[PDB]
């Protein structure tokens, strides 16, 4: 990217999870006049973020790949899948930190 | 009343290393109160392993009730069992209640838990035992009573 | 401030009051009622649970429809097992809706439901209606899933071709496809699907439906209904009736065939011709001429009397306590207010005031 920041003077760099702004200019060696990032004026809260650390029965959850085949995490997962998917009206879309996770854990799932 | 019996919870713990009996404390102030207490005798001193329902009973007269607590979890020193809760297992409600009040914040609190006759407090201690991952011992009163345990 | 915080409340509520248009509303109209019998009805977020709240505001809804909708028609299905089971042909007589309202209470819902098979179903009912009449379907959707046969959208483009409405009461979320048929069924209007948030709420999301529904500018349908006045008659000795084939002691005449009939208002079983009382009628009248809002007066300004003009109650004595109608210029107290343009629907100092 040395090229692309020499060549051209003026290089807006926008995106709307770009967080923490300093790394980038760490990790490419560019400098900014301005770097800020913006906090929407909304009336009413439109996202519910939320962080799940237990399942019901209060023991931890984490996607340690050492542990993928444990029957608590999997099971804890697996109630936490079913009980969103009771409630979400239309969609519902899951992310999991590799392929991999995703193959082994689906497969406990339906046994 | 209420006010009056308000407690200096978690400054003095209770822990064991070696089957030897620390009384350790997180801040150094609490040792002018327990060194120089007349019954007793990141700091801990030792005391014999009769002498802890001495040091107990005086604890909860010196204004500081201890607490043990267990942290399963980042002890590596027992060596860890491997026991679960097999699928077919269905825990009621109230039991998962008196589970909760008692590894609420992740460490195993020493209490008691008081339900119904027949309500399952079989099924609670195994679940303890289940989640803690430790070796375990069990007493009870018959020895027909320690029969169905193993059942 | 927590007085003021009533009042204030109370003039906001009184804001979506105070824009009050005689809009053309339909008062002859032929409802289907679409409840939901499902497992997603099983829940306990209303006691004692959904399926035994929702019939019993069925019931009450059944009672206030027709008192206020004397003219009107209604049926009644039910999504049961994956089906539309239909409870109740689309007639005018209250009391044979309500029955099947409390049969339908003892049995247990289950199965999933399905948004087409109603809807295909109402459109079937509704197909044998006069173009005068508005169709409408009152759907009480409970469930946050929707298992169909077939294409959901073709079904919502053949209602928006017959002209049938559609009003949707969810129960746990908003649905994609429930918000798609109300809004391309209402012309575009997305404030007919409603989402309870309550047991209170839900009463009176009922209650409004009652109301007759404005009609659009562009949906013509105006005509000219033969309709007849029957004269009542006193016999002694009972007759057979010509809609029941029962012997009744009384019972009306009709005008065109001089059949009798029970009980009004019902189209003769002979002339198929709609029989109706001028009483019917009247019922209707306020929603023609709607009584325009009464604004709050300021305590600026001075009063006529210190009593009501209507109820004879001393105004009590910051805010002005006293609603003045702006066509004869009258204060009223707060109580009368209330009852003036909900259970009355003619202003007295109106009446009063000569011309
Ligand atoms: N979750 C459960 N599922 C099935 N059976 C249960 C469950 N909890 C308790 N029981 C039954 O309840 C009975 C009494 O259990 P027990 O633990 O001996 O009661 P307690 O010790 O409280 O008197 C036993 O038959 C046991 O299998
Ligand atoms: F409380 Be039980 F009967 F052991
Ligand atoms: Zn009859
Ligand atoms: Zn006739
Ligand atoms: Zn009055
Ligand atoms: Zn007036």
Redesign the pocket.
């Known amino acids: 990217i040395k090229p692309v920041f020499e060549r051209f003077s003026s290089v807006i760099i926008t995106s709307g999870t770009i967080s923490p702004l300093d790394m980038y200019p760490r990790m490419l060696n560019f400098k900014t006049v301005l770097q800020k990032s913006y906090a929407m004026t909304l009336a009413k809260k439109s996202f519910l973020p939320m962080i799940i650390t237990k399942g019901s029965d209060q023991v931890a959850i984490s996607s340690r790949f050492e542990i993928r085949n444990d029957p608590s995490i999997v099971r804890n997962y697996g109630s936490m899948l079913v009980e969103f998917a009771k409630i979400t009206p239309d969609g519902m879309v899951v992310f999991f930190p590799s392929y991999l996770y995703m193959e082994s854990i689906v497969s406990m799932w339906q046994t | 009343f209420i006010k009056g019996a308000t407690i200096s919870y978690g400054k003095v713990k209770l822990v064991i290393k070696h089957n030897r009996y620390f009384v350790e404390t997180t801040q150094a102030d609490i040792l002018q109160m327990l060194l120089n207490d007349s019954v007793i005798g990141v700091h801990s001193f030792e005391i014999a392993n009769e002498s802890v329902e001495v040091v107990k009973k005086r604890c909860q007269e010196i204004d500081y009730p201890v607490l043990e607590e267990y942290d399963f979890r980042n002890d590596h020193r027992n060596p860890d069992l491997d026991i679960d809760l097999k699928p077919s297992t269905q825990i009621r409600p109230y039991q998962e209640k008196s589970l909760s009040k008692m590894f609420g914040n992740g460490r195993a609190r020493s209490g008691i838990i008081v339900l119904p006759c027949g309500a399952g407090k079989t099924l609670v201690g195994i679940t303890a035992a289940c989640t803690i991952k430790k070796s375990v011992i069990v007493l009870c009163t018959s020895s027909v009573s320690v029969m169905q345990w193993r059942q | 401030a927590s007085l003021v915080a009533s009042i204030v409340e109370a003039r906001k509520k009184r804001t979506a009051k105070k824009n009050i248009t005689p809009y053309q509303r339909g008062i002859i109209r032929s409802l289907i009622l679409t409840l939901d019998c499902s497992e997603a009805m099983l829940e306990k977020d209303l006691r004692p649970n959904r399926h035994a709240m929702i019939i019993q505001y069925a019931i009450d809804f059944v009672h206030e429809f027709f008192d206020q909708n004397p003219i009107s028609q209604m049926g009644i299905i039910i999504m049961r097992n994956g089906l539309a089971q239909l409870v109740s042909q689309v007639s005018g007589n209250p009391q044979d809706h309500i029955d099947a309202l409390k049969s339908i209470r003892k049995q247990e819902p289950k199965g999933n439901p399905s948004l087409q098979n109603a809807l295909e179903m109402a459109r079937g009912l509704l197909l044998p209606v006069p173009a005068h009449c508005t169709r409408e379907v009152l759907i009480v959707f409970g469930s946050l899933s929707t298992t169909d046969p077939g294409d959901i959208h073709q079904t919502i483009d053949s209602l928006v071709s017959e002209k049938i409405r559609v009003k949707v009461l969810g129960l746990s979320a908003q649905v994609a496809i429930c918000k798609e048929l109300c809004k391309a069924t209402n012309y575009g209007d997305e404030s007919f699907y409603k989402i309870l948030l309550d047991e209170t709420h839900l009463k009176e999301l009922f209650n409004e439906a009652v109301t007759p529904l404005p009609v659009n500018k562009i949906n013509k349908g105006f005509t000219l209904v033969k309709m007849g006045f029957p004269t009542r008659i006193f016999e002694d000795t009972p007759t057979f009736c010509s809609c029941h084939s029962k012997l009744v002691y009384g019972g009306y005449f009709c005008p065109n065939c001089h059949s009798k009939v029970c009980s009004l208002p019902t189209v003769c079983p002979c002339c198929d011709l709609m029989l109706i009382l001028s009483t019917h009628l009247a019922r209707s009248y306020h929603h023609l001429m709607p009584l325009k809002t009464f604004a709050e007066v300021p305590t600026t300004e001075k009063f006529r009397s210190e009593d009501?003009?209507?109820?004879?109650?001393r105004f009590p004595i910051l805010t002005s306590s006293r609603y003045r109608c702006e066509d004869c210029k009258q204060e009223?107290?707060?109580?009368?207010?209330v009852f003036i343009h909900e259970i009355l629907h003619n202003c007295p100092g109106c009446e009063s005031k000569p011309v």
């Open positions: 009501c003009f209507s109820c004879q109650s009223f107290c707060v109580d009368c207010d």
